Paper text:
In an intensive crystallization screening we obtained two new crystal forms displaying space groups with the I212121 and P64 symmetry. Resolution for the both ground and M states was 1.9 Å in the case of the I212121 space group and 2.5 Å in the case of the P64 space group. Since no substantial discrepancies were found between ground state protein structures in both space groups, we will discuss the structure in the I212121 space group as it has higher resolution. Although the crystallization conditions were the same as for the wild type “U”-shaped complex in the P64 space group, in this case the space group is P21212 giving the “V”-shape structure similar to those observed before. Summarizing, the “U”- and “V”-shaped conformations of the NpSRII/NpHtrII complex may be crucial for the mechanism of signal propagation spanning the membrane domain and feeding into the HAMP domain. This work also represents one more evidence that different crystallization conditions and/or different crystal packing may force the protein to adopt different conformations corresponding to discrete functional states.
The photoreceptor sensory rhodopsin II from N. pharaonis (NpSRII) in complex with its cognate transducer NpHtrII serves as a model system for studying transmembrane signal transfer. This complex displays a 2:2 stoichiometry where two transducers are flanked by two receptors. The long rod-shaped cytoplasmic domain consists of two HAMP domains (present in Histidine kinases, Adenyl cyclases, Methyl-accepting proteins and Phosphatases23), which are followed by a methylation domain4 involved in the adaptation processes and a signaling domain which harbors the CheW/CheA binding site5. HAMP subunits contain two amphiphilic helices (AS1 and AS2) joined by a non-helical connector.
Author numbering:
A (entry chain A), D (entry chain A): 3 to 218
B (entry chain B), C (entry chain B): 23 to 82
The structure:
């Protein structure tokens, strides 16, 4: 059942949210921004999953069904994930506006493409993909260089979080292609299940690994 | 080590969801409907390996 | 790192074998035959995660 | 095609065999026994896969087909794998005869059970499983204690090889239960494919990890 999967998403995101608010209660002098950000990432996502679980935002497009809340989520949370990674890396402002802009282009292209019945949706996907490679270049390149200047515990947490992000974000566009927006080889249910799993790892899992290391 | 048991638990959950689609398709009596459900389940499970590896890799 | 690309390569090979059974079943026109082929493919792929994890774990 | 999968098994085992004979050419004063053993493990298996690929040893049992060579392989090679692990661990003779005997009981029970149409094949499986837990206890217990006394490079290679063995050998009995000998939920083709993959990792993969560490 689709709404059952959405409800499991909501509950997972909530647990994560409550966990980050709680853990954050005793955050250091310049660590609050991390905890605030994670409550933002998982809290926004929880609300989105609730909305989908209630049946709202299910858009008909040709022969598929596009979940608008999913994409509105991504546009808001994925740059917050990138902001988090920018914090460990130690970016200045200029470096932020590049990657965040790249990231935003990806989600808008996926969203746009998702909403287009015609074959030109693949061109839109094309542009999202090119922007993604741009984002990846920044994560593994310059931002990694930046992160090398920091204390080794922070570097190691960066590499760990960058690896989780780059690997798992690279899976999304495949779900897009094989799923309803692309060739429709994955049923809506399987598409939703995979994303729910991804969203929980990329946000809640991402977060807990950070809780683990902020202690250790 | 506990990560695997989390991954394994979810992987069988996902299998059961996919399987549940295959069987519903089967009760339809239409082989094409079962095949369409089967391809989705195979591709999903392949994709699911990649997620688990990423989660394992990142944690290892 | 190359291990994953080896694992991924094999995992899609296995998918293609399983899929090839599903389709042969499909050309039969018998939904039950497709379901029997689908359950085998789902269980195989679940089992295949465990092998890949072991190989990853042992190497990580 | 079944025989195609067997032929891929044979070729994989052969490559491994040639690799171990070659690498062994420049083995140390007390390292030859390791290389000899790996040529034994992969060479026996190659011959078995060739035999199956040629269509020989396909036994009819009730509604399934049991590959006798597969099991004759296991009876010969699995104790050789255990012998290898016993070498890194540094066992004396008494400790060898326990684990090897345990191991042998597992394979004979699987083989016997495989050849029995009746429901009592599960009792035979039962006994194989109990012996396996016995074997596992020795790998993770006493043999691990033994291995701790050795130089750290050998200890680390032991843990690595013990982990690969315990994890992957634990998968076999599930293939037995879900496959043709058990509930027949896995088609013969999928059963053969999974085992081919396992046999290559547990032998050739096992071996290469040892080549990697004997250098490093
Ligand atoms: C918590 C939710 C997350 C981390 C969502 C990440 C989504 C992506 C990385 C989507 C990437 C896409 C492309 C790279 C191509 C165009 C299709 C997209 C938007 C799905
Ligand atoms: C290279 C070939 C190898 C490492 C084969 C290993 C086979 C096993 C560990 C089989 C175990 C079984 C049980 C534990 C239960 C009874 C069924 C068996 C024999 C399949
Ligand atoms: C911890 C909250 C529940 C998580 C369920 C995730 C299901 C993913 C589908 C595969
Ligand atoms: C039935 C159609 C209505 C579609 C409206 C689109 C839904 C809005 C998305 C809300 C979910 C995101 C929550 C984030 C808020 C902070
Ligand atoms: C698309 C332009 C956005 C750039 C913002 C970052 C600031 C300048 C860095 C060079
Ligand atoms: C690996 C999955 C392949 C799915 C096939 C989808 C076919 C079209 C993909 C096109 C993507 C690139 C952009 C092309 C611009 C037009
Ligand atoms: C082992 C780490 C591998 C990380 C891969 C990430 C690199 C980018 C791949 C994503 C490509 C998206 C578009 C696919 C087109 C078909
Ligand atoms: C990790 C991404 C999964 C890729 C699936 C490959 C198979 C698609 C063939 C059509
Ligand atoms: C690693 C072993 C795989 C176990 C499969 C679980 C599903 C079987 C249910 C019947
Ligand atoms: C290197 C030799 C070829 C190996 C093929 C293994 C196929 C396994 C089936 C899944
Ligand atoms: C057609 C039926 C014949 C069955 C005979 C059983 C086959 C013997 C097994 C040989 C394979 C193992 C090779 C190891 C030798 C060292
Ligand atoms: C089943 C008996 C086999 C025992 C062999 C090992 C030697 C004795 C150790 C006590
Ligand atoms: C997880 C897979 C379960 C498969 C079901 C098979 C049913 C019988 C299993 C029995 C094994 C234990 C030995 C019983 C002795 C008689
Ligand atoms: C993460 C490591 C886990 C290793 C598991 C090995 C322990 C033994 C399990 C095998 C049991 C075989 C019989 C199954 C009965 C159903």
């Amino acid at each position: 059942g689709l709404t059952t999967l959405f409800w499991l998403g909501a509950i997972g995101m909530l647990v994560g949210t409550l966990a980050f608010a709680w853990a954050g209660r005793d955050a250091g002098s310049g660590e609050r921004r991390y905890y605030v950000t994670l409550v933002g990432i998982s809290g926004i996502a929880a609300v989105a999953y609730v909305v989908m679980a209630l049946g709202v935002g299910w858009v008909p497009v040709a022969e598929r069904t596009v979940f608008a809340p999913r994409y509105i989520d991504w546009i808001l949370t994925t740059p917050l994930i990138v902001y988090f990674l920018g914090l460990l890396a130690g970016l200045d402002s200029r470096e932020f506006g590049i990657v965040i802009t790249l990231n935003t282009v990806v989600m808008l292209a996926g969203f746009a493409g998702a909403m287009v019945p015609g074959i030109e949706r693949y061109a839109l996907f094309g542009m999202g993909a090119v922007a993604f490679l741009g984002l990846v270049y920044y994560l593994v390149g310059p931002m990694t260089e930046s992160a090398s200047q920091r204390s080794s515990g922070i570097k190691s947490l960066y590499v760990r979080l960058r690896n989780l992000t780059v690997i798992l974000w690279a899976i999304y566009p495949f779900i897009w292609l094989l799923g309803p927006p692309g060739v429709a080889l994955l049923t809506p249910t399987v598409d939703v299940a995979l994303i729910v799993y991804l969203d929980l790892v990329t946000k809640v899992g991402f977060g807990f690994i950070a809780l683990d290391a902020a202690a250790t | 080590g506990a990560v695997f048991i989390f991954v394994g638990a979810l992987t069988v959950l996902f299998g059961a969801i996919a399987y549940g689609e295959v069987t519903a398709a089967a009760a339809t009596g239409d082989a094409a409907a079962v095949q369409e459900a089967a391809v989705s389940a195979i591709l999903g499970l392949i994709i699911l390996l990649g997620i688990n590896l990423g989660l394992v890799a990142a944690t290892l």
